Amino acid sequence: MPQPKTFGELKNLPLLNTDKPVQALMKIADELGEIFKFEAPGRVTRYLSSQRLIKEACDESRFDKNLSQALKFVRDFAGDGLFTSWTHEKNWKKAHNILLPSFSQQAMKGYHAMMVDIAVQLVQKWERLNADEHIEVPEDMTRLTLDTIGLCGFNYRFNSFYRDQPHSMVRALDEAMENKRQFQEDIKVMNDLVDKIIADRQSDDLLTHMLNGKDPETGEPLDDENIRYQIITFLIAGHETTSGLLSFALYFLVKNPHVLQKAAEEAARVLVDPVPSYKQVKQLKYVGMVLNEALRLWPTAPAFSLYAKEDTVLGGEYPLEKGDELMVLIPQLHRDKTIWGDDVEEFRPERFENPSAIPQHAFKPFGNGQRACPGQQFALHEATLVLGMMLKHFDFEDHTNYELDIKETLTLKPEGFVVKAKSKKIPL
Amino acid sequence: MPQPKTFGELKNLPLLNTDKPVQALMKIADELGEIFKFEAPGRVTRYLSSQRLIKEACDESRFDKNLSQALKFVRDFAGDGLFTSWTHEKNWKKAHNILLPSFSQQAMKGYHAMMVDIAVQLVQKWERLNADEHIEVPEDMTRLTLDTIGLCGFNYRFNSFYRDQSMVRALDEKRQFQEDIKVMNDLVDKIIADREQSDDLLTHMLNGKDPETGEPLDDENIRYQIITFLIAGHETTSGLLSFALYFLVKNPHVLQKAAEEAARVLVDPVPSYKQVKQLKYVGMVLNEALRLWPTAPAFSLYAKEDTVLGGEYPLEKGDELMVLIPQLHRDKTIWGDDVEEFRPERFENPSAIPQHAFKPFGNGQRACPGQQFALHEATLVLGMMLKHFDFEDHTNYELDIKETLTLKPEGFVVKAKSKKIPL
Amino acid sequence: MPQPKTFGELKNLPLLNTDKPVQALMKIADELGEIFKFEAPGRVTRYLSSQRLIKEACDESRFDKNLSQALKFVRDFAGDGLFTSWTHEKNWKKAHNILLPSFSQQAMKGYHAMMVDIAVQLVQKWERLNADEHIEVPEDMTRLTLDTIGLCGFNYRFNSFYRDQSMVRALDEKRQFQEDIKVMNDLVDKIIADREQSDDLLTHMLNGKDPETGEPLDDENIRYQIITFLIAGHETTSGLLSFALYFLVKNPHVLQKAAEEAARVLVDPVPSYKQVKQLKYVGMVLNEALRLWPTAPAFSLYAKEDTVLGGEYPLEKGDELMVLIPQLHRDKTIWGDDVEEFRPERFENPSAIPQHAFKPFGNGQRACPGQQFALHEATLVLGMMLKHFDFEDHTNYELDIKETLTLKPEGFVVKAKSKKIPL
Amino acid sequence: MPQPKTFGELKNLPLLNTDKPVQALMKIADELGEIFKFEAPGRVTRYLSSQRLIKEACDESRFDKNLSQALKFVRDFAGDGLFTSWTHEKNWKKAHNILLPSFSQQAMKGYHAMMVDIAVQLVQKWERLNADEHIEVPEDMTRLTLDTIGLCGFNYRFNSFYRDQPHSMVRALDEAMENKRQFQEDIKVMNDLVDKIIADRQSDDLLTHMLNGKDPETGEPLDDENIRYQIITFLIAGHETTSGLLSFALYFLVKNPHVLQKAAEEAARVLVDPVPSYKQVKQLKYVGMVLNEALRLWPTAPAFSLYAKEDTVLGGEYPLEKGDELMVLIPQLHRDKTIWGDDVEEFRPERFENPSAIPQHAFKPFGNGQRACPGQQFALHEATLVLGMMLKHFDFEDHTNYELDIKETLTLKPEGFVVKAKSKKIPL
Ligand code: HEM
């Protein structure tokens, strides 16, 4: 089995002593192919890149979600919330069942108004810029997605558009990625706030399903503690990933003017009213295609981890023992030439025009099976709404001829991406 | 709404009583513009010609595929195959899901060797001609496309190049009709039953389960699909290669540029898969031929709900539209004034073309699943043709377009002078 | 002439070496009465506190505006703008004539829509606060007044409500000083040049000719004026709204009467121009806040010729006076004994107030040209604030007045409970 | 173009068959707005009320002074004096140039002593009234302004304070506004007197500049005939208007006690000496403001007339032909809500505290351009002196709660206005 360069008894570990580890891993996958071994002192895992192998790995009878080293550390503040629990922990399935209805079409129609509230603040911010001011794209996308999950999820206003300096969580994430005292202080700040939000609470949100909801299976509700973990979890899982998507999407649009014009024409033809309706967002088919293609190239939660439930042979060549770990490297999956063609690096939303044409397990920016993203429709609805509005209301210019530079935390975002927006002066 | 001349109680119907109805309709569209009412007794439709209205018609939340009068009559032998089924029929979505990945640009790798088998038969036929002899172009292209689907579709050899000449008899229209259906069914069902693995669509159909329902196609629907492959993707592809060759002979600087690409790219005795992907200019030539004469030149839609077309024309749920593709492809606000000229360079960058402006393969989920297959076949064959011969428009052919459910240049003949490059 | 305590060769100067000089001076005025000599090395002035002497000081044939020590130092960045120019400078009278009609109560009709834009931003900020959260009052009023002049003054958006936080750095005082001046000039001169018509003061400046000289302002003086608008009429107006809100929370029957007017008058989702003109009681509240804490609390004068003040105090040509406005506004022979009470009803009829008794906007031709602007803005915003929220003095705030060249209640915080009335 | 009610072939003419025609016209302007057409048999004119249109009308390149019907008739006794001549008549410009110096600061300082002479007689008259006697305000103001122009202008004492019955001119004016024989007799009386005053004449007056003055332009003096017309003209133009102003001003003061007290305090603080000095009068800023505000509401020469010099379009909507007439209705101009605010009817001298705030052409109680009042500084100086003295020496009481009733001749005055004066016993 292929294996990248080693560092004495550190084995491969220093390979990840970089700002950009997922990107380093993508480059190792390009030289070594569909599978390689990665050793650190005291652990091994295998990185998977081809649809052929990833599809077997997605077989829930053979493999289950693993918590990677990263996630194990995140668990210090995310506890047994959905993202950082084991499938077999009682609280995974309980919360999974309680939370599914929170992502129901009925509920999505409920959130639409609050999504529009934050989307409007974003569009007003940009209308109000002076001539030759520019926009800090990920910084503004982050303000939006944080406010949106704050408001839709627990009726709480972060008021990000009213601030330069933010509301701890990002400092907790970086440490996981004196240090002890800070970390503890950060966990505490997150906890009191959230626990205070919980204690204090009649609203159209995720916190409500959690307060008034019983798991049909066990008949038990979530206790207040798992509730806070769930709240912490929405903010870590369902905000920066969405932010990155919108930033990558705008980037690809400004780099591909013909794609921009198709999406813009769609937004003008479809978004006929001063504010978008739920139904109008569902009509933005091409914008949806742009977002999927952005996700294909730069899936913003770019890896997930698995363990073998039993001894098993992968692909008919690589035997695994019970407990062995696998990592799915999503961006390499999404660049599998045998699936997508040889032009995998080009940005072509029309790959998704006829979606049944995409083979099973070839496109996985939202994970797999019962452990896949529950926030998928929410995130796509938000992103489609916001992008539609952006393209309806402004022309965009890549005034610096920005060079793609991708910052890695748990998630991916293009750092320093800036554009200028020229208002079409269409009333909001 | 504009409307062409009427015939008392027959309304507009006698206008379609002609050998060339799509061409009649293009001419009407020239006179009346982007939209006209067409009325017949019992029924009404609206013909659309501008990108401006057609782009709304292509909105899948507002419009869905309709089976035209012609398609309703093809359904007697094509059944609930993909071409002649309604989107809401359970078998549409099942066959769609099962069949669609096996038509990827990537799936062509498995069909490539078989396409080459027939393409080599075509080239040899032409090398073996004596000096005064000429090529009957659509007759030989139909030989090729038919054998190519037979072979790629179900590992069956029509052996059209060993022959001069019942399915075609059926497309015409009421008792011989029953017997025509009979031969196709006996033939196709025997094959299905006879069938062990091949590199064909039938293999994939038998081994195929729909992700949604978890069901396979039943043997009968599978029969309908094979019939449909031939009805849908042999004559259209044949027409395309024939139109393409016509335009090339009529535009010798264009022919010379395509022949140069062919010679520069097709360096091996037979073309590889990657080499075909590299015939950029030949691809542009084919797209331009499709712009001017899309070989399935119309498709029908119905309004899913009450809606308004272009801010002007109210339609009610169930109201019909016909997209007149050759007129759309002549829309001057999209293409510029020179719409009648053959200029492959319009496709220098295919992504420069506006959404819903170029639609020779129809629309959305009801678009042609065989698009990449047809283009891979046409590019390979046309590449080989340009590599191996020079062509002469020896009669100075006068374009005459015959209409069935598809379009082809009837009587188009050429001479080929072999360049003597071996296979 | 009475005179406060001296410090050897430093005379009275060390008395001003304090965070709160105007407040120090009020306290001195309490001890010494209507007039005192204030001496520093090299210079002398006389501080006036009674309406009886101030009314003679306001006689324009006998006294003219003087640039104080503080204003002489502001002139390094404010230049020959209106605030920091001598009356006899050609540019004073030119700018005065050009600018003054564009500040009519009537000219506010054109600024009204822009004032509402910022006022709506203020209200939304507050509606969007979570339940335990509080408002930093002078910080938010400064956000509002600054953005309002930016927008009404030069169609420029400071976007202060999208921010937490170099001009203010300059008012403080000698090398960073040069760079502070630099940013303001680059910024303002670019705008002037960039500039097509807007509803702003800059438009009027560019199109404006002085009736007397027939001249326009030059681009540089125009730069000085824009700078001056912000130095003169953002902090004073900010201080006013903040003091007004302080007094309202400290006097809940007064707040309730103002809130009742607001609710009765502001019947539409946003206020119209006429409706603001109709907030009589809110206007009275603002005037009473200005009586107690006039936010530009002093102005300086010099004797145009030898003259005698109040039959007692000979002054020579060029001798200086300072009008201590908060003391004048506490003159018991004009106002009665209750001068420390907040009573808007003193302004039931503003014309009942004796000439030169109430002077928060200075005097004669050198008075504040932005008076109606400031009051229109303050009345509109305070009307909206009272319409949309109840206010709670949640810390039982202890008035602490910070002094720059203007006065504001530092650290003043409140909670707002939304009344849930839509915009 | 709006037009008030008609009377058959009399058109609008009977509208002016009233004692109070300017006031009738003001009420028509309130219903019809900034411009209306007024037809009489054989003539048309357009009445103007808004600052917007009046400012164009004041453009001397487009419009020149017209003699209205009234002025044409007055011309029967005022001849080609300044007030009733055409701009292009040789004698207008000649006399205009000769007379300008007669209104020079140097000359105004000259007149001050004679103004004080008559002002003193006015104040003595009132000191000498018995308890509970009252004052006939316009009758006394008229006695003052006639004596003042008599004495300052041509060293002639009308001695109005020594009489009940007056010194013909008013009978000549009324007729213009057996009849023939009287009119002729009146013209004659005015003429002999004046011509006698001229023949008979070493003095500090207007008659002197006229006798010893040459027009710098033509080098010609005024002949004795135009001199008499000029003398007649000072008495018709610069006496009743000034009288009306002082009467309106006192009226507004007694109706607005807070304004009275401000003006009175100013008069006591400023007029420190037994008789006012020239410089002290110039210091009466608030009294000046009171007079301007009186003039704003009730301009005592309330209309002037113009003709279009060439075809021209007024305001971009009303085309005019050469010779077309306009009337400026000054009191309506002065009530233009778009200029002054909605409280235009209130008496607020502080409108004038910061005079540069008044827009161009919004305030025109002294006419326009080269045809504006030359007696403006004289009239304001006189009125300011007299009002200051009145407010210095007496308290005033509106003992009858007088109801405003405005008599119209060429000019406006409040008829029957009476007050009681209580002496402050301050030595004169
Ligand atoms: C485009 C934006 C998003 C992307 C690309 C994304 C991607 C993913 C992926 C790949 C996983 C699987 C992780 C693993 O296997 O270890 C996941 C899980 C999860 N995500 Fe999302 N996500 C997005 C938005 C959201 C949003 C908006 C929410 C909340 C509303 C959310 C909440 C969650 C939760 C709770 C889990 C854990 C699910 C479970 O195991 O029960 N995500 N996400």
Ligand code: HEM
């Ligand atoms: C140049 C060649 C071709 C052209 C111009 C063409 C054109 C089209 C058009 C316009 C439609 C939409 C019809 C409608 O909306 O009613 C369609 C559908 C279809 N075509 Fe093609 N076609 C071509 C080649 C092929 C080939 C090679 C195959 C199969 C091997 C094929 C199979 C089909 C099928 C099954 C449908 C129905 C799809 C569905 O509705 O699910 N076609 N074609």
Ligand code: HEM
């Ligand atoms: C409540 C708010 C305000 C207060 C209390 C205030 C107070 C004053 C005072 C006391 C002066 C006279 C200074 C002196 O004699 O040295 C003055 C002058 C001035 N103010 Fe205001 N002001 C206010 C608002 C404004 C606004 C909104 C503007 C402009 C938009 C403005 C522009 C000016 C200017 C340019 C001068 C100098 C005028 C000259 O001398 O020609 N002020 N102000």
Ligand code: HEM
């Ligand atoms: C407040 C009192 C006065 C008012 C309101 C007043 C008003 C006016 C007005 C409006 C005109 C222009 C008439 C027109 O355009 O047809 C005028 C002209 C004239 N006035 Fe005055 N006036 C006053 C006092 C005086 C006095 C005191 C004198 C003499 C000393 C005087 C002498 C004249 C003369 C000679 C003209 C004609 C000027 C010319 O066209 O050359 N007026 N007056």
